[PDB]
Amino acid sequence: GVKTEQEDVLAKELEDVNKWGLHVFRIAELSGNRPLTVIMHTIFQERDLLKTFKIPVDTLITYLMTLEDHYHADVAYHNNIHAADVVQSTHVLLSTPALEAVFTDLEILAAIFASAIHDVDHPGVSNQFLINTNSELALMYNDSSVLENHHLAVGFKLLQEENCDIFQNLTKKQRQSLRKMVIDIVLATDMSKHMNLLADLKTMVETKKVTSSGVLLLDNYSDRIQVLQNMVHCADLSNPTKPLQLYRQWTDRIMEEFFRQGDRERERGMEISPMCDKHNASVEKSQVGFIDYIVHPLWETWADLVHPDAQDILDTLEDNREWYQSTIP
Numbered sequence: 001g002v003k004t005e006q007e008d009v010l011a012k013e014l015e016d017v018n019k020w021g022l023h024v025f026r027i028a029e030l031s032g033n034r035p036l037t038v039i040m041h042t043i044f045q046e047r048d049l050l051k052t053f054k055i056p057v058d059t060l061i062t063y064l065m066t067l068e069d070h071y072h073a074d075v076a077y078h079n080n081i082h083a084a085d086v087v088q089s090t091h092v093l094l095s096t097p098a099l100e101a102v103f104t105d106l107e108i109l110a111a112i113f114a115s116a117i118h119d120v121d122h123p124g125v126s127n128q129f130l131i132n133t134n135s136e137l138a139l140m141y142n143d144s145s146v147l148e149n150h151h152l153a154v155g156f157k158l159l160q161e162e163n164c165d166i167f168q169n170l171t172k173k174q175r176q177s178l179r180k181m182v183i184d185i186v187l188a189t190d191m192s193k194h195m196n197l198l199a200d201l202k203t204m205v206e207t208k209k210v211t212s213s214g215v216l217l218l219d220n221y222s223d224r225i226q227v228l229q230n231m232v233h234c235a236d237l238s239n240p241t242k243p244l245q246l247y248r249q250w251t252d253r254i255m256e257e258f259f260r261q262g263d264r265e266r267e268r269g270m271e272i273s274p275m276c277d278k279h280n281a282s283v284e285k286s287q288v289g290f291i292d293y294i295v296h297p298l299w300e301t302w303a304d305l306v307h308p309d310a311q312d313i314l315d316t317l318e319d320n321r322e323w324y325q326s327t328i329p
């Protein structure tokens, strides 16, 4: 009834679960490629979600292992490790002082569950690739947020496997509300919705209302869900805000995935997607471009929303951007 030594080392690494920059690749190794399951279980216990939602623990573990198994180990970036990273990052963002006591237990559950499922069964190619290949998925979803609709359908469908229904004790009211928020959050991870999400985030910063305890004031669903959508989108795009040793590992992985799509696009003979061309790419230029145009405007606006809780994260992003720039041949 006592941890093995490997379990002990894993447990000590998980003591950093509340911190930006968790060694998530080490946790994946230590856990035997179960980063999503162990991190989720840890967060659910830490936030007392099992008791609050009457979730039986064997059901939670069974579902988590099932969900984790439906991520593709042969996909370099969009895999269970990425899912675990987004979950843990969302967990840290939810704990930010500016949001203390703002969200209900069910909204917290929605943000974390949405994070866990948000990329499940990702084939490692883009929506546009699936559309252009006449793939079944694209036909199923009428070319519209193809992957994101799929991640949702899979994440929910897996609740129906043996001893997997972690929501079995929620009321119909709780379930309908949970399901709607989860759907709204995952559909918001489609990059084609990025400019719109950011627009609404800026608007909210402009009309920002704090309240009583120095805490953000969100008094309608539209506002509450937009903050959660943006929070998870930030987590999804948090790699360049992490310590450089982590960030670089993620960059390698996504470029591996992109270059592979590029190869398959050359094989087939389609015109090669942006920065997916292995032979004449600039990994460094692309990272600087992606940060200047997407990641920095997003995180800067988030930082404004929760000022100054996110200052250290933004500084790290800026340091990493300078590093990648300095490294341009």
Ligand SMILES: C=CNC(=O)N1CCc2c(sc(NC(=O)Cc3ccccc3)c2C(=O)OC=C)C1
Pocket: 191, 192, 236, 237, 238, 239, 240, 247, 250, 251, 254, 274, 275, 286, 287, 290
């Ligand atoms: C015309 C619009 N273009 C886009 O919407 N995309 C093109 C590039 C890109 C993503 S998502 C994503 N990256 C992420 O989603 C998270 C991440 C950021 C930085 C390093 C590793 C991973 C990238 C990217 O990194 O590009 C640079 C190589 C989607």
Ligand SMILES: [Zn+2]
Pocket: 118, 119, 147, 189
């Ligand atoms: Zn995604």
Ligand SMILES: [Zn+2]
Pocket: 082, 086, 118, 119, 236
């Ligand atoms: Zn993702």
